[PDB]
From a paper:
In order to gain insight into the specificity of T. suis HEX-2, we solved its X-ray crystal structure at a resolution of 2.55 Å in a C2 space group. Overall, HEX-2 displays a modular structure with a N-terminal catalytic domain taking the shape of an (β/α)8 or TIM barrel followed by a C-terminal three helix bundle, whose function remains unknown. There is one protomer in the asymmetric unit. Analysis of the interfaces and assemblies with PDBePISA37 revealed one interface leading to the formation of a crystallographic dimer around the 2-fold axis. The structure also revealed the presence of a Zn2+ ion not far from the binding pocket. There is also a disordered surface loop between the Zn2+ site and the binding site which resulted in the lack of electron density between residues Glu199 and Arg220 so they could not be modeled. Additionally, the positioning of the Zn2+ ion implies a noncatalytic/structural role, potentially in the stabilization of this disordered loop upon substrate binding. As the enzymatic activity experiments indicated that T. suis HEX-2 removes GalNAc and GlcNAc residues from glycan substrates, its newly resolved catalytic domain was superimposed on that of S. pneumoniae GH20C, which has been cocrystallized with the GalNAc and GlcNAc reaction products, which are also surrogates for actual substrates. 265 residues out of 320 aligned with a rmsd of 1.9 Å and major differences are observed at the level of surface loops in particular those surrounding the active site pocket and in particular the −1 subsite. This structural analysis indicated that either monosaccharide is capable of effectively binding to the predicted −1 subsite, whereby the key contacts will be conserved with the 1-hydroxyl and 2-acetamido groups.
Numbering used by the authors: 54 to 199, 220 to 529
Write the structure that this text describes.
Amino acid sequence: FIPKRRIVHLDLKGAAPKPQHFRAFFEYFVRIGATGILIEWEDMFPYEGRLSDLRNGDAYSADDVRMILSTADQLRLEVIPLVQTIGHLEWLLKTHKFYSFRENPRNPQSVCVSNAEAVDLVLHLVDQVMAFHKDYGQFVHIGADEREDLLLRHIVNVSKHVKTKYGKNVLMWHDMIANIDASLAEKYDLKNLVEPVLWNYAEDLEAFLPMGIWETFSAMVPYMWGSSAFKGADSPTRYHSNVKHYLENHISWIKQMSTASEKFREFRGLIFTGWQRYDHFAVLCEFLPIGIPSLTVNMLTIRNGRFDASVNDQAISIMQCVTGSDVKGDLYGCRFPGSDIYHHVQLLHEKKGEIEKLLLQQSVQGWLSNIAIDYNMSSPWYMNLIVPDLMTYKNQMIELSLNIRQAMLEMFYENAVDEFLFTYVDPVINHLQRLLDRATAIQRRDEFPVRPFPIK
Ligand SMILES: [Zn+2]
């Protein structure tokens, strides 16, 4: 079983490329056998009217969006918009402006389904997007991911609005309905309204997925999609490439689809998720350039129906990496969009592992403790072995920061680089510097007090 639709998620909640660089990405997406993309604009769309105010400051122009979709179209890439319609609306409801619209007045996450002024804002939001996307895809994704009648009547509502006005098929995330009685699904004629997208980013799905989950859903709907991950599902603070993880998800998905393909009028395809933050408010996870290796190997793996040293190897020559090499281990001299940023961030991963190993060895542990730092009281001799290592790693991390800023600044907006550095690079420079200061001060002491000396 090979999914005929293979869709690459583009999550713009953060680290949203500058607009001239989508062509490159998209051409790469063709070159690995993607049929389409899923664009979650979040706050980066050129919103207008009442929504103009909840736009990212670095938001994309009308002329940009029109060029992005054209470029997609010309490269024979389908475009599915993702618009959140119930939850994950922090970007919209978190100012004063729509405070009134929230399910819970403290949480900027959900909108009150039962408040029709709010449902109205949602439908405008849909229409503002579909304005641009209408001429360019057969599908729309409405979210409804991470009393049941109010939910389903909200979905129904939204679905029909899209189906009717734009003649497209609605996809939503599965979690909202996996529980519900087959009965309620029929009551709301869901077999005719929505295509559930089942998502699971685990390595062994066989471990996490209930049994006859597929049997459950085929008894409810004719159309089903699946959703794997290439990035944004290791850890929230995952900033580097861990291909081994995503690859397990993809192998584990092949087996699943090869059992589920046949119980549906059509298993439509798989969406390769690529979260940029775990949520609006979370930190930046792995940048798209960092996810290219994962994404390359996992596309080829789903189209070849399994992973083998053949897959590995086409993968590499597509990335124009240096021959030999393993896609699961280190890669050198690759040439793909953002490949410099990859190179540099992967170095960051390595340097930081060294630095943590040094901060965990006997020297720093025993003689650069908190009492050493606060009471300038330790062995000069131990300093002489530490201070040199602190200074090297500190200076290397300073140069890494420069390089990454330069690399990332050709493709990303400042805030995104500033956020990355602030999160994943700078705290270490600061921490090395503060240790280097105290270890240097102790290295300069020659006279120490007899014990005991006051402590608190
Ligand atoms: Zn409510």
